[PDB]
Design a protein around this nucleic acid. Structure first.
Lengths: 90, 92, 104, 79, 9, 104, 88, 79, 98, 9
DNA sequence: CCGCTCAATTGGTCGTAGACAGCTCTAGCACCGCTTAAACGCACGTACGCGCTGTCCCCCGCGTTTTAACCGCCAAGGGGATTACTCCCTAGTCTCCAGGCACGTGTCAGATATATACATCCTG
DNA sequence: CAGGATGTATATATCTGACACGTGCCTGGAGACTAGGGAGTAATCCCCTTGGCGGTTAAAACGCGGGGGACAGCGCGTACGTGCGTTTAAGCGGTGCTAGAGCTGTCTACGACCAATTGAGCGG
């Protein structure tokens, strides 16, 4: 059905123009994206329920990212998320 | 040398109190939290929960440190025992 | 006309992530910045793992990425190893590592 | 300011005695202080993250319980 | 210019 | 008229469990016997840990249950120890255990 | 809080034993933890099967997934004994 | 009937070699067989539970993936 | 004739199997074992080939990590041979069987 | 007739 | 143990989630035969585990001295809960219509091969 | 060390299927509104957190003295690694069958949602 193969390939072609990817490595990257999506979404859901909020917003996603990703990974992901949100809302 | 230690083990294994003094632990917790947000207030229950968790974690780690000690044919626990226990747990 | 991924500068979908967030039953409502933030974070992590895996492949002198290259990229990076520390990668092997006492 | 020394050598000795330890090496106390420092930093970082998400300045026992729940150490008694 | 990462370099 | 919890034979609130399932964002619908089943499972587990804790309190010549007794009961039973294996009980202490090589 | 019902159950199992105020917070934590464990796995099972209803079947399967060995065998036997009495 | 002896000693030694093991005691193979049997029993029990909940008769790879994720052993590459 | 010292082929094997990503257990005996174990939980069970492959891919990584911990437990005892007690100490510390 | 288990009795 | 109000139960509709039958084909099981790679059995030797013994130093036990933890009390105010407007943000619904998914297609990255030269580890 | 043999990288040529692309198309995302509550904000109250002080005494710190234990070295014997020759199923490639997973199409009952009516569980 659905997968992230197209978007993983776009990011690959933009980060490594001449490197391809096998069908097994794509299955692994789809599993990776699904895993991390479910982790961030579950942590955001718990944050919303902890604070008696009935909506998941950008701040809950940011706090979930801070709780989950380690060290500088969290800092750079938070910076990228903020940049995307202020580019979208502009 | 060793009987007052077996008696100490028996004394502290049937006791449930906190073995770290509460004021130095509270100051340690506040000093650590000072690096994340300045002007941070703490509930008394927050520090009490932190101390219960920390003491349980340290007793559990010493229980594995002792097993790593007995594995190497020793009765003294050494820092290498803590490091082995923490590696096998996955913390290192 | 424009897509909400192109509106945010992303290559990962924000419409699909929005629909996954709404259907996944995480909250009664979902904001209009949660999908953009989540798609940006997912794209950043994908770009990191792929940028390291394409380097692992190139050191091996291959113009493709296989699961072994992804394992070599993940376990050799301190932060991606902590993030993916309970994860098994199929056909990924292990990091070549022999303890020093075993060597002659 | 050097409040890690407040976790005294007798206190570490009692914590080891509860763990069944009979003899303690003289370098175990500083290693234990480092281990405790790392554990406390990892828990109070998540507790503070939970605290500033509620726009609060007081760290709550529920923040500590949640920060412990997410590291696989569930705490019973404080809510 | 590719999508190089600033976390690594 | 039978309060719906005594209609099943339980001392745990079927209505409160139904409310919590409907408000916890678990699914879009909640069945009828789902709260009854969950309240029956919670009540039995409670009665079992409470069965062992009262026994432990009796062994210590006490007529009250303190965190020490709950900890003793949980960790002296293999299945409740397996279930509550990553659980820290406040003011619970440890199971008395010193190894053979340490004992003289 | 489940204090009233935990005390009702304790009077059924030990009629002459009391409970502390710190040992009741522990039982409240235990109930609120196990409820979240079963209801988060019944939730997972419904989504895996593309179902929107959490029935007694998902609760039974989640209990069998989370409870160890002989705990599950008796928790299931009590869950199907309560659903039977409740619908009859 | 007795299919655990199909996990031969050379296979266990190969797995040990991938784990960096240099010398292997002669009693390691039976301990490894018991450990693998226990691990497989635990994973397959949950896989079959997921199978029966869907009223299916064939165990899907997704059943195994779910049975592993619930033991904290999430596996990539199988869906 | 030409004999290697009894620690050389072992290190060469370590280098060989730490460089490959294959499956070190024969697939047919492992499939038979998986079928036999499941036979105690449900009769007339069927398996997707990918299900048995996932089971093998998980079991082999589990065993490799266990042997990685076992080697550390053996080195801690100033040994190079891994013994059953090293497996038991590893499993006890990581909670698998305490 | 106090409540008891059959898993324990 | 007493007061009372928030939460529980009951009655009734309706819409849709889920049960059930029919079907279609995919994929999982079962079998056969040949090849040969791998497992297995055995012999030899050596290197490692394990036990013993001895040194000396580090850890424990004990008796003073000091230090600060703990306890009780007094006081201030910072910020956590709570409540009452207001509006802005999100769900819901009905058009479009482009992006991504499901099949053809070939051509190159990868796997696989011998003749060759270079580099290993183990001795006499 | 010389060097002789084992392990192994290098140069150079054929498959070879799989991945990257082309193509039709269909459905899920986007756009443009409406409705209405969820969250924000301002005001307020009072709890509970922080800060200081004074006294006691329990615990920590310190020094000293033995001795138990960790570690080092040595010797032995046995068990595991290496290699070789033999046996045995793993694997690969068909060949065949059918059990059951996936998918409509239909219908029904079950749960959400709203309206009385209470009546028990929380605070004191």
């Amino acid at each position: 059905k659905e997968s992230y193969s197209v978007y993983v390939y776009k990011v690959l072609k933009q980060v490594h123009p001449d490197t391809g990817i096998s069908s097994k490595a794509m299955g692994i990257m789809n599993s990776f994206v699904n895993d991390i999506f479910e982790r961030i979404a579950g942590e955001a859901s718990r944050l919303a329920h902890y604070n008696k909020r009935s909506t998941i917003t950008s701040r809950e996603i940011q706090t979930a990212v801070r709780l989950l990703l380690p060290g500088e990974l969290a800092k750079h992901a938070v910076s990228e998320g903020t940049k995307a949100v202020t580019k979208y809302t502009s | 040398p060793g009987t007052v230690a077996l008696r100490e083990i028996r004394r502290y294994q049937k006791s449930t109190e906190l073995l770290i003094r509460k004021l130095p632990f509270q100051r340690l917790v506040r000093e650590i939290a000072q690096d994340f947000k300045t002007d941070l207030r703490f509930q008394s229950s927050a520090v009490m929960a932190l101390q219960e968790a920390s003491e349980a974690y340290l007793v559990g780690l010493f229980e594995d440190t002792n097993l790593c000690a007995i594995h190497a044919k020793r009765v003294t626990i050494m820092p290498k025992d803590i490091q082995l226990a923490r590696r096998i747990r996955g913390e290192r | 006309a424009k897509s909400r991924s192109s509106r945010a500068g992303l290559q990962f979908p924000v419409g699909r992530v929005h629909r996954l967030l709404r259907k996944g039953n995480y909250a009664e409502r979902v904001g209009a910045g949660a999908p953009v933030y989540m798609a940006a974070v997912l794209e950043y992590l994908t770009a990191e793992i792929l940028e390291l895996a394409g380097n692992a492949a190139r050191d091996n002198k291959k113009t493709r990425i296989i699961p072994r290259h992804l394992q070599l990229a993940i376990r050799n990076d301190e932060e991606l190893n902590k993030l993916l520390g309970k994860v098994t990668i199929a056909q990924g092997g292990v990091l070549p590592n022999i303890q020093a006492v075993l060597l002659p | 300011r050097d409040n890690i020394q407040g976790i005294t050598k007798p206190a570490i000795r009692r914590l080891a005695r509860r763990g069944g330890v009979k003899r303690i090496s003289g370098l175990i106390y500083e290693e234990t202080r480092g281990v405790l420092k790392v554990f406390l930093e990892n828990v109070i970082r998540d507790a503070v993250t939970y605290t500033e998400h509620a726009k609060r300045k007081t760290v709550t026992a529920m923040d500590v319980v949640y920060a412990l729940k997410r590291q696989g150490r569930t705490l019973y008694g404080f809510g | 210019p590719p999508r190089r990462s600033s976390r690594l370099t």
